[PDB]
Amino acid sequence: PLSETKCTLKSFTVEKGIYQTSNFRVQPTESIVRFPNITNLCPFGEVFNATRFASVYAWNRKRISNCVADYSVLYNSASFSTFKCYGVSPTKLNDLCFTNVYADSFVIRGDEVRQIAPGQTGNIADYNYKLPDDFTGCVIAWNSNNLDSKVGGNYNYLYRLFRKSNLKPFERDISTPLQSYGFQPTYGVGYQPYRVVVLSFELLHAPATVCGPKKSTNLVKNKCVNFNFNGLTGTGVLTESNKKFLPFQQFGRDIADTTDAVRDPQTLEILDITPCSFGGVSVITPGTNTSNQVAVLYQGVNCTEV
């Protein structure tokens, strides 16, 4: 600090007096992130856990919009046999926002799980359900062998084998072979039916109706931290106050129209936003020919470290 005065004054001799050689600011210790309550959202159990599905040609499409899509149940639960996810990893699914999401639920055989790919041919590919070349979607499969299987074959799906021509990608033909293929559980893993749900993704100029990742940490007060609750990012001191906000009002303002407080998007609490401590560094030292003793003066702040 004696040389800091020489660095500020640009001179090797320090005159007796008080000089401001620098400024100080306290860096944030950690990050505090809180999001609105993620419990009891709209699940995928309606398409996945449903009792009875339609056939491969009878496949139904559910429109997923204006809700939160939770993709962590798919890969992390390890209850599903296999999946093919194109263009993105199963972890990047939760980290992106989609404009529209479609779910195509159908049940295919065991050896037909390899027949679902963009731009491929097969028994169910051309005659029943086809994927376009540009399809970026992410599909997951699991076994129906203990449920949809019946002795002598199930008459619900009927597995229509024959068609006079080939179907375009994403074309549903409900027109009423058959001659239903045997679904009896006694068949091996190749002839046993599996449940396959195709997820169609769309990204447009319209705002995304699907919500992205959700993560929350612990809340700490009376410390300088980086705070982001769902609406705003910044660094400051979080302290609970006696202020009262209307239930439909979230962010507050000071006289300067700067945000002095934030409400928890999850629980009910009101914490003020105080900028972290800062100020100038004042050095008190006598002349260079007197002594080397210096005194550091923090302007307008109390020292809690020492």
Partner: peptide, 28 residues
């Protein structure tokens, strides 16, 4: 005739005067 505390939040520092109010009345 706080406004000072709100202005200190945006980076505007208000320095305290060298001569306090108690010493001014003593000079008077």
């Amino acid at each position: 005739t706080d406004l000072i505390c709100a202005q200190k939040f945006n980076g505007l520092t208000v320095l305290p005067p060298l001569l306090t109010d108690e010493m001014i009345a003593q000079y008077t």
